[PDB]
Design a protein around this ligand. Sequence first.
Ligand SMILES: Nc1ncnc2c1ncn2[C@@H]1O[C@H](COP(=O)(O)OP(=O)(O)OP(=O)(O)O)[C@@H](O)[C@H]1O
Ligand SMILES: Nc1ncnc2c1ncn2[C@@H]1O[C@H](COP(=O)(O)OP(=O)(O)OP(=O)(O)O)[C@@H](O)[C@H]1O
Ligand SMILES: [Mg+2]
Ligand SMILES: [Mg+2]
Lengths: 343, 343
Amino acid sequence: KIRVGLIFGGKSAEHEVSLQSARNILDALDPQRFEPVLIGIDKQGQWHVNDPDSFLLHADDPARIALHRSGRGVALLPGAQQQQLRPIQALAQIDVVFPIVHGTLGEDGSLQGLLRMANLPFVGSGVLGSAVAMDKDMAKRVLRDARLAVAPFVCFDRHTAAHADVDTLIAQLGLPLFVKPANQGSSVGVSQVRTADAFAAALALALAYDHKVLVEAAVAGREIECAVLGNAVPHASVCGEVVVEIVIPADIDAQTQQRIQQIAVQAYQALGCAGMARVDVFLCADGRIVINEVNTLPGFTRISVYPKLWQASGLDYRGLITRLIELALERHTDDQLLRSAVE
Amino acid sequence: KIRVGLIFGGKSAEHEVSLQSARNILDALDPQRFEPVLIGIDKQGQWHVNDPDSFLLHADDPARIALHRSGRGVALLPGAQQQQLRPIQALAQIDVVFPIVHGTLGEDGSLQGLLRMANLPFVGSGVLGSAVAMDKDMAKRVLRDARLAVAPFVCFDRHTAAHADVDTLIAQLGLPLFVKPANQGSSVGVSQVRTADAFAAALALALAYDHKVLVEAAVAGREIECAVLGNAVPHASVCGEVVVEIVIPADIDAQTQQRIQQIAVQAYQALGCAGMARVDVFLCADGRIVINEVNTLPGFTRISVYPKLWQASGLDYRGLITRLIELALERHTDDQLLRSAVE
Ligand SMILES: Nc1ncnc2c1ncn2[C@@H]1O[C@H](COP(=O)(O)OP(=O)(O)OP(=O)(O)O)[C@@H](O)[C@H]1O
Ligand SMILES: Nc1ncnc2c1ncn2[C@@H]1O[C@H](COP(=O)(O)OP(=O)(O)OP(=O)(O)O)[C@@H](O)[C@H]1O
Ligand SMILES: [Mg+2]
Ligand SMILES: [Mg+2]
């Protein structure tokens, strides 16, 4: 049996979603192959080891569900090769980590880097793919370069936002404008700017969340989401359409679904993603495909889109979780050897 | 006084260079402002706390210089806000980390992510800038997109290298071809392919070091290096020319030096670098400028190019180290507040 270190929670608006994801994953984990070890991260950034039967407060109340802050702290020994995760006051050897920490550090490559420094195999994108997908500015430029269509846009920081010319922006990108912080860690900060006079306040709110803010042209078209799974040979799920409230499978052509599937895969490859991502695209009347977002940490509750998309493609939740673990171990094994060359 | 956690060594061919860098930094650290704390990483990946007077074996012998493996281990408490770095068997509170770990994990964003997860301010690029610069494939695509010239090239993985057509490559990119692994962690793996028949062996050696291998067209022109310093408002040093053996200042025009300085800065900005980088460009007869590399972990010995370039620009070694620390704290303070918004 292999021990699966489920790390979840985080300083995030999505904190409760991560709680639910953890409970869902825990209940689907195949007991023939896996034993869980639970590490919860509270809303202050603090790590707590918990027992599976007692890691949640008010588990069955979605308005009150909270992390049991057991105060059982965690230590990581960088460069350790065994018992890398240690109790501050013993803990099962973890063999693979399934990180579902929502929030900037859980998503942006930082947590991934810590897991790398501890030599722990782990589920999902590695440092680069996470950092790159998470920064919507760098992601659009990378996508753009791989000749995938993304919304046209301009990016400002604090040092240049003070200089923004709304008329030139409206002349270039039109109206409405979508203003957003570059780090996709939160959905906070996103304003639809309908008139010229609303622009400055959008720009200033977004800059309280990140150092970079994208201002994008509106993309007119339907919203489609597509789940991707895999390392070197990624696979795409059937499509889900979001309505102006997700519909699975989306009401579109086999051939349209196929174009979107192919673009989701190329988008995934271009950013260097691994394990899993959800790709959200706009489908134009006419039907060009424009990528909105590649998300490297989808939801994993039973009501979440990413696993629903897989369910609708013939892949059960249990089976999805298992395959995410196997992918994490295959990547880890491959990386070992490469790390291994040197000196 | 602020405590400077110097972390150095690493599983790297450059291991001894990091040793020397550490000793140089230690001797220039301004004693009015800074106390050092030493953490050495041996060639196995293992962390050792040392005293400044005793961290090296054979310090004055460049052929024998080695890390004193004091076996004084280190623990990191993720999400800790104080005493984040802890002895396994006490250690001064670290206030800023100056990481000089050569090798894949020290350079590619992983170490940076661990430092982020420990909430430690640290010198040099953050997760994204390090990951992106380190992967020469993603870096060239990002550079390319920012309309900076890079050597034309094709990138293969294991899954596509088996399919490589040398004739189409020679038809597209010419001869010689430069074959290299994408991760710039090592200088190992770089072959100059002079005839068609040498190509397959280059490709196969490079693939033992990374999962991705660039094959580039030769760029005919002189090799120039330029040091960059700063966060939001980067500054460029005078230029150094490498000869077919560095010359400082380079023998080129004020105006050529200025074009190279500007391109180094734009390259630095495009990849999202912070603190420091060395930018290595080719200067064509004719004189277009093509970027070869952006390096986010330059050498820091007294004989290294990056500090020599700064010395030649009026910035003393002591003064350079101090400014790298201040930049690390300014970034950390700014990020704090942003992290701070949320929920
Ligand atoms: N350029 C655009 N054109 C048209 N609609 C847009 C654009 N940008 C965003 N939107 C709309 O706003 C929604 C939210 O934007 P986006 O998805 O980038 O931010 P987010 O932080 O990821 O929010 P969410 O968590 O809902 O995805 C999109 O689903 C879409 O409905
Ligand atoms: N496309 C190219 N055209 C011409 N010369 C090249 C090219 N690529 C590499 N070289 C030569 O080979 C040297 C080493 O290549 P590169 O610098 O990319 O690898 P590295 O691993 O960073 O090596 P180093 O540590 O010496 O920089 C370059 O300084 C240059 O002399
Ligand atoms: Mg979206
Ligand atoms: Mg170079």
